[PDB]
Amino acid sequence: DTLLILGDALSAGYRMSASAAWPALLNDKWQSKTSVVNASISGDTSQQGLARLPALLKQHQPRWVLVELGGNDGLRGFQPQQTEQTLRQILQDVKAANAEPLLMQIRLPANYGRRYNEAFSAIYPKLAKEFDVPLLPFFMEEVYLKPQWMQDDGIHPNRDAQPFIADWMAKQ
């Protein structure tokens, strides 16, 4: 069994080595039974994620796929319909190729705007219900009240939060 991770620097690792990223830590924790491979790349869009999708699907071919994308798209700001359609197509492609998608419930920070945050957060339960996949909660809130787990920018967690993120994902 192998778990593929496809997302942003939250899993790719912002300004840290590949082993420093949390998915590598989770793979180390799960060496015996189920390996973990990270394919996340920072700054990707939904269209860019779709472009990178076939290569990863053919190279890895895992049992489960962790799909956490659109968070940076929401941060930069996409109209809900376009990003919803692109994510729908990506999920359809992932489920088509004998791969179980894992969608992460992403909620934009409360200062980003309540209306858009609610509209963007309501997408994930709808997609999870439509595709019948678990929806792990937005654990960056667990980092919201942890300045020691964050960096100067406040966007990416520090290396200290990486073990915590790996532990939380292992629990999930």
Binding site: A12, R15, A18, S19, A39, S42, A51, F78, P147
Partner: protein, 804 residues
Amino acid sequence: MIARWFWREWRSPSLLIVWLALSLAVACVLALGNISDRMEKGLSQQSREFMAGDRALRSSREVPQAWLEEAQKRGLKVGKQLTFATMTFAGDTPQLANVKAVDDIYPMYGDLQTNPPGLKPQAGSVLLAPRLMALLNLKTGDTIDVGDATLRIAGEVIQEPDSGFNPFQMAPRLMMNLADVDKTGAVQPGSRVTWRYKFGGNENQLDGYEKWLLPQLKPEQRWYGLEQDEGALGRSMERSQQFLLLSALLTLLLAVAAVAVAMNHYCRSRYDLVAILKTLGAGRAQLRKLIVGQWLMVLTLSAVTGGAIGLLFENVLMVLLKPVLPAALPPASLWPWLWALGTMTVISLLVGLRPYRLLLATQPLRVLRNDVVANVWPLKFYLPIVSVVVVLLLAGLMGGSMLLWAVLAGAVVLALLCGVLGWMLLNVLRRMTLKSLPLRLAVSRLLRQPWSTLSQLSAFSLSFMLLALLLVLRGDLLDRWQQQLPPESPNYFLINIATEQVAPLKAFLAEHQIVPESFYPVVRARLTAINDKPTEGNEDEALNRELNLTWQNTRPDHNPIVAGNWPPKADEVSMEEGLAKRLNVALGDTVTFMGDTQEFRAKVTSLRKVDWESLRPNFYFIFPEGALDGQPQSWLTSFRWENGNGMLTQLNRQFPTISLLDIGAILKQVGQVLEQVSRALEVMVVLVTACGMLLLLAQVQVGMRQRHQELVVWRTLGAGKKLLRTTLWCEFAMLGFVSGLVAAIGAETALAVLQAKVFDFPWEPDWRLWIVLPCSGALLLSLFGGWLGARLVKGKALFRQFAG
């Protein structure tokens, strides 16, 4: 009694020329120092205005108010700014906006320009970027819901002075009053809200509050100023400061040399007076008081005249250059006054000390008949002591900067080369036969007194090499800045461009009469292993964060290959020299990259120079076409366009996934800074060149004064004026040729050292200097000597003036 003495001596030609040279040196040094200090103060003030403050404190959360209360008690002015991002809605259309909130204190420094100008952040109204306004198709007087609160739109913002020079701020600018933030309710825990704190006031209270806060600093807090910044503009400011300090050092050294020559001439002239006063058995205290009183009166008069002339010259220059100058500079300090006065006094005293004690010990007759003087304090020991003293004094004055070390190394290598070449020239000339008259006359004049020839050669050589160093440094800096900022630089950037979307994008550009530049592909990969050794654990940024690899086809224009061959072949990469050095990577090393879970190895086959100050896209690695075709590729491009904004909105609607970036304000500001500093440097180099020309004229006139007796004897015998002019031309041309020849190598050495350890630029030898400097210096000296001899030959009954 002695008043009539001094009044009559002031009319004497030798004392007159010595005093004129001293006063000119003092005035020029004082004026140059004052101008440089005022320019530096203006640069600091404009840098603060660009930063909109004197001290910056950036925090991710709320700092305790007690520190700000302490700052208020200290009297320093403190301002708070809150920056974040929100998703506003033009009706149904959502759009990200970078929201900023300031108090009434802002703008603390500089000026904020809005559309219409004069608007200020106030309650009940907000401001949007013109790009944002066009994207949301709103206008002045509209009401928009920012965050969770709806407010009226006051207008657009032309430019904000404190906008960071970051070419990654994709979010368009939004502005609102600091009091209305709680209306939106965006202030919540876990929010990426940045608190900037601007501090302004006198530097004494600034330092006091800084040292008060130093024990209280926290990791979440970043406290700094402007010089500590690693930005390219800050480094350029540092280079400008070093350039001004170098100019001050050069003019100080030129003044030192001129006053040293003048003091030597004066002390040699005073020999007869010393001998006659000692003959009558005058009291040692009495004669000492007389000689030191005359010397100090001369020094004081020269200092007063130099100060007055320098003040008047500075006022005239400020009046004349005011339209060229940006604004009225703040007044400077009195440190240049002390610098000039101490330099003059110390140099004169150290030059004149040895002859005074030597004549005190020596009998008057041995001075009169030039017999063997007392073997006390030989020059073989006197010169090293003087060199050590002046080196220590300069180090104390300028804090022992490495540029001073480079200058002194150049000076000593110039001195040794001058000595060796002078000995060789003396031998060859003694082995040489001639046929023309003025050539033989100049040869004889040089041969008879070799030590004065050596002294004049050294002075002219040092002056020429200092001037050449200044000119070369100014030219190199201007050329580098011009290369770094092309006037045709694009003012807009498109990022996150898809490979399938470039063709519609290319058609869009072609329809819009836009000629795009190279579309840079981007692949995100990390250098995991170097020479089969993993790079994990290394603290180098390139080995920790992501790398943006790319491939091209045409040879880079701004990155000439220093080592290696273009283009790299299959499994070959053109690497940057700095990265190769910092990663201990040499040519042929195996570099292993991981990107999109795909691992590929390349061989370093080309070393290239990359300047991060350049606004063009720059990369740590370059691949050939076909190396990373299978890797996923994003695309980046830039274009220049200022005609309207509707096409931008149309492009955004057609390509919402493509990020748009505006750099117009940053480009305008950096251009303004560069042109201001360029004007400053041009004025500085012009004035330094003028002062150097004046000092060279003074030295040539001193030499003519020293040769006056033989010239007037020749004219009395019946020498033609044309013959005398030709002889002076030949002699001074040969002197200037040799001086420029040695100064070429001296300037090469000094430039190499300073460029290696001060300006951090690659050194290159220039044969153009080696050719121009000797002939140019020879021509200048020949013209000066010819004009001076033409002036001197005028008059009647000049033989009566042989004694003087």
